[PDB]
Please model this.
Amino acid sequence: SLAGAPKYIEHFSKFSPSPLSMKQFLDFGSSNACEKTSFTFLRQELPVRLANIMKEINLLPDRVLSTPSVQLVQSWYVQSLLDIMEFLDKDPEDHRTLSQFTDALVTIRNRHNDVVPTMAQGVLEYKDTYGDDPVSNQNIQYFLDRFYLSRISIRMLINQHTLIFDHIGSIDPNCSVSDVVKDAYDMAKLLCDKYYMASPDLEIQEVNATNATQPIHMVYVPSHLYHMLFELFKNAMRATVESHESSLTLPPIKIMVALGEEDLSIKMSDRGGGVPLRKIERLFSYMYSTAPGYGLPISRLYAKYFQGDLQLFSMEGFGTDAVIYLKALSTDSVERLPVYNKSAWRHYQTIQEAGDWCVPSTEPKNTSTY
Amino acid sequence: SLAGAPKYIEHFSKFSPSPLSMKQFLDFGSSNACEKTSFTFLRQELPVRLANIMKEINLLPDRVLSTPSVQLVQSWYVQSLLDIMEFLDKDPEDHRTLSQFTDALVTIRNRHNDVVPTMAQGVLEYKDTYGDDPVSNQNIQYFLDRFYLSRISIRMLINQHTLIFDPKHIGSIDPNCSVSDVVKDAYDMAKLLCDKYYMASPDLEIQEVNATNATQPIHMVYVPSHLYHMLFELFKNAMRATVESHESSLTLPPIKIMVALGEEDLSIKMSDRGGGVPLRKIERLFSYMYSTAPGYGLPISRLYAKYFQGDLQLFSMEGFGTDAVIYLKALSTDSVERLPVYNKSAWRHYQTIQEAGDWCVPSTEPKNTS
Amino acid sequence: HMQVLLPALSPTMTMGTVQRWEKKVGEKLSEGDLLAEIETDKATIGFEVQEEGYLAKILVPEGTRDVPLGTPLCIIVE
Amino acid sequence: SYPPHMQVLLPALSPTMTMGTVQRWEKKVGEKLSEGDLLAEIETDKATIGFEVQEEGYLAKILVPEGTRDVPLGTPLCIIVEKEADI
Ligand SMILES: [K+]
Ligand SMILES: [K+]
Model:
């Protein structure tokens, strides 16, 4: 019942989401063509993940929560929860049940397809209506990382089931990192040379410390890797073109792929003139990037999703290095999932607080003599 | 008082420290050496800084506080505070009390000379007795960054007064500090230690990119010993890593330095091909608890960078090597003291408790998906 | 007296492992504090205090594996 | 009878501070305040220090507004009452 929604939220938000490893995905999708086991996992797990995050959507500032776009998103989540909860009483041993469940997941995925730009629209509707509030901004920042990571994880779950039951799903067991780098480059180059009429070359190098001569492969979701690389390539290309005057001497974008025992690291280096350090932190800020640009903070979420990271280090006047850190081993590649609990609830009860450190005066005392 | 010490601490701890810029240090010694205003500034400011940090000292775990080494350090701070308070009602314009004040500063600097290793032995005495609990460790980390930065700031003030009132430097500040010369010195000293502790050492490569003026060597207003400290520590690590990860004395990769100067930032990147370290271990390198066997060079070098609004960042690529970047403010007006204040906000940080965690943790025995 | 039972922390959870008690006998418990870490087959969940009081006894000690639902873990008095 | 009120006075935030400047108020009129809340930014020649609430209650009126410089020590900046309806 639509009326009972707030109690279904209470029931399922009380549970903790179940983070899966890429090993588990791989062991399941290659051994278990078992639709029943996936159905019975997902008919519980998807409501758990939905209810956990919806519990946090409802902890948003009233001014954000009440925007048309955030209300539209919330209604999507309500309906998707209701769609899946219809399968709770259903017999896993009936194939009509299973075929209808896959159809319901396709519908949910189509419905939620524009969640990212719609949520960003809502934040923009808040920005261009309710001036500036720091505490609200920090709660929004806190929420958005979790919401978007939750969303990445739900889509992953839906993608695994649908690709397997109507690559191991979206997972490539033998993903050629260099090939994904080239694909991302080729696409960004295309957009660059058709929006500037000039583009930098690519230089790739590999250092495989585990096996000196072997091309670097990993178990990964290629589209996630591509997403990250594509966003970073575009930035490096834009920066390179905008900071240079000649068509003929554009510095190349340099890629280093390194594989160690624990990490697979991909560094992208540009000579695009760099950016001041004080500005690096706002590049992952959702509030700063909403004009009057969610590529970077979301790319970092893709890296964090399986316990990796994405870090930037520029040198103002020279250029910037961007590093994607990934886990080399599939047992280490575990889902990074937000969980609603009292600990999460406290993060929304943040107050306006005095500084931890001294703030210098805007007009410091003149110390020169007479 | 000696008896009234906690009243004096309560009085002076209620005041904010006064963060000074590199420019203000420079303008003070731009012409006349005025001992009077410095005396009257420092006879108040040093008690303020001492008292602020001493409130935080007696807020730490009692199991750390009762430790002999922390007891000794705290006794130095009580004495130093008392020594200065004796000048509180003394008259400037009387040249004897100025001369006595300088004597009192050198005495304070001499007894505080070993504050860093002593505080570290205190953490060590705590380690080899109680082990570790998440909450106490969290407070010790938070405290030590503040304690050591307070220390750097107090030593800076004392150094400024004693060097001026007891070379082209304005105290410890070089108005025209050649970044590359400091890089060369730090390297030469580290090379010397390396070539005697391994009998092999990497070469040095330096490049400069001055974006503000393409053909001018990069100079800045800075305290050269501070810059030397950071670079010396980084050079040793990069040399150790390079030597220990290589088999040949004839073919070992040079350490590469890039100095960049832009409108806002002065950046120094040190790159080694020392084999790198996993990302998991990077965050551990700036923790004080983990870096005490069963090595405070890194977190302390970072504090030196942070002290004038800079930073020190590491990014490694496991299997390849590590980049270390020092960020400095390019402008003396932006190079301002980073000082901890004791307030209710600082107090709250010592009132933390074990909490659930707002992110999902996987099972150590994850479900076999077959 | 209040008795704290092991709940379903996951929809199909039958049993959990008491990985570590994060509270001691005599310690105050505020509503929302970390009581213990319960490890399942699917996750390790931080089990939070829901009723305020004081911890008097631990019935199921640390490291105890495969404890079913509704099992009395500890007794708390107000 | 007069509602039991507590008054916030501008103190010395530096040992050699006599005058004060209210940079920006962080609590609007009508807001509750806990012992530890950021009340306002009081700026001087030496530092911008975040002034903290030391007495719980509610903000009733701002006596000394924003931007106003040279505010003496002990000068009432705002009025705080024990209860909510007392505003
Ligand atoms: K939950
Ligand atoms: K203070």
